[PDB]
Amino acid sequence: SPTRLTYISDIIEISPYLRRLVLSGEQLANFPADQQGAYVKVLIPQPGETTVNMTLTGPNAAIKRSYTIREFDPVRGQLSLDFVINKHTGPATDWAKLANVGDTVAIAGPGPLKMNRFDFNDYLLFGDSTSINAVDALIKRLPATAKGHIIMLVNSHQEQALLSQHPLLKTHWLVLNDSITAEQQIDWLLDKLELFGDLPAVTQVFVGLEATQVRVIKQYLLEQQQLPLSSISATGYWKRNTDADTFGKQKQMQPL
Ligand SMILES: Cc1cc2nc3c(=O)[nH]c(=O)nc-3n(C[C@H](O)[C@H](O)[C@H](O)COP(=O)(O)OP(=O)(O)OC[C@H]3O[C@@H](n4cnc5c(N)ncnc54)[C@H](O)[C@@H]3O)c2cc1C
Ligand SMILES: [Mg+2]
Ligand SMILES: [Mg+2]
Ligand SMILES: [Mg+2]
Ligand SMILES: [Mg+2]
Ligand code: NA
Ligand code: NA
Ligand code: NA
Ligand code: NA
Ligand code: NA
Ligand code: NA
Ligand code: NA
Ligand code: NA
Ligand code: NA
Ligand code: NA
Ligand code: NA
Ligand code: NA
Ligand code: NA
Ligand code: NA
Ligand code: NA
Ligand code: NA
Ligand code: NA
Ligand code: NA
Ligand code: NA
Ligand code: NA
Ligand code: NA
Ligand code: NA
Ligand code: NA
Ligand code: NA
């Protein structure tokens, strides 16, 4: 896929921890129209710089980070991405918090879609503010008859509106704050799992969460609920105390 030069045409705060950037430009005119919930790699300039180049490796290559397509309107040729802000420090979140309309942004991708099948009727969808737009994309493709649960960790009640309604899927939300420890988050996730009891054997599961959360949920599903591996689409979106490049190489060595 060709790297594309885009322009920020709008910025909107969605919550105190989530900033939507709307990208525009003639380079998006032929962007693929079927990739909601897929990710792109955003090139991030060095702090206090604005330019990036096409160098692949070494000290002059741009930092790259993965962000989910919230919306691509082909009539309008505009791409929306929702960046978590004010929860951590790193090149992309820092850059996103300070970005302005008219700034240019180079993007690559989209990357290969890793997502569940849309044709079943039993689902658990686990996500957080980093994966919420992948969860939304999946919900909007499921049959109206699909039963199950949506289980989300968000940084603000305001983020809940990002998920499509669905007639039957039941939502469960935990709004995070600094008093809720990593262990308590895992306890909450496992508490929800146990509350679902014996899962239908045909249940399909999406997980897009922090790396250890993914490990715990996946192991529970495989060993306690005995779901087939093929029924789980699990991705570690981020990992505590680990930058994206380090994390990427960890996942290459040992996939989740
Ligand atoms: C397919 C895919 C799609 C993604 N889509 C989105 C998206 O749409 N929106 C989004 O915000 N993120 C998304 N992410 C996650 C995003 O790529 C990471 O959060 C990334 O680490 C952010 O880059 P950074 O440069 O800000 O921080 P990094 O330099 O990668 O990390 C620096 C520090 O920040 C920690 N950290 C990173 N992210 C978080 C976080 N959200 N919360 C708390 N601590 C964090 C790290 O553990 C590390 O210690 C996606 C990831 C994947 C794999
Ligand atoms: Mg353009
Ligand atoms: Mg993030
Ligand atoms: Mg942040
Ligand atoms: Mg969709
Ligand atoms: Na909002
Ligand atoms: Na808003
Ligand atoms: Na957020
Ligand atoms: Na243009
Ligand atoms: Na993708
Ligand atoms: Na730069
Ligand atoms: Na560069
Ligand atoms: Na190149
Ligand atoms: Na070079
Ligand atoms: Na995604
Ligand atoms: Na997004
Ligand atoms: Na997001
Ligand atoms: Na920030
Ligand atoms: Na971010
Ligand atoms: Na599936
Ligand atoms: Na998202
Ligand atoms: Na649907
Ligand atoms: Na569909
Ligand atoms: Na609903
Ligand atoms: Na903890
Ligand atoms: Na999480
Ligand atoms: Na199993
Ligand atoms: Na299966
Ligand atoms: Na399957």
Curated annotation (Swiss-Prot):
UniProt feature coiled coil, ranges: none
Any Pfam family hit = FAD_binding_9
User: PROSITE patterns from the xrefs?
Assistant: FAD_FR
FAD-binding FR-type domain boundaries: 1-119
* Cofactor needs: FAD
Domain of life of the source: Bacteria
Into which EC class is this enzyme placed? oxidoreductase
Q: Which UniProt keywords apply?
A: FAD, Flavoprotein, Nucleotide-binding, Oxidoreductase
Q: Which InterPro entries match?
A: FAD-bd_9_SIP, FAD-bd_FR_type, FNR_nucleotide-bd, Riboflavin_synthase-like_b-brl, SIP_C, SIP_fam
EC numbers, comma separated: 1.16.-.-
Q: Which PANTHER family match?
A: FERRIC REDUCTASE, NADPH-DEPENDENT (PTHR30157), NADPH-DEPENDENT FERRIC-CHELATE REDUCTASE (PTHR30157:SF0)
Q: Which family does it belong to?
A: Belongs to the SIP oxidoreductase family.
Q: What is this protein called?
A: Ferric siderophore reductase
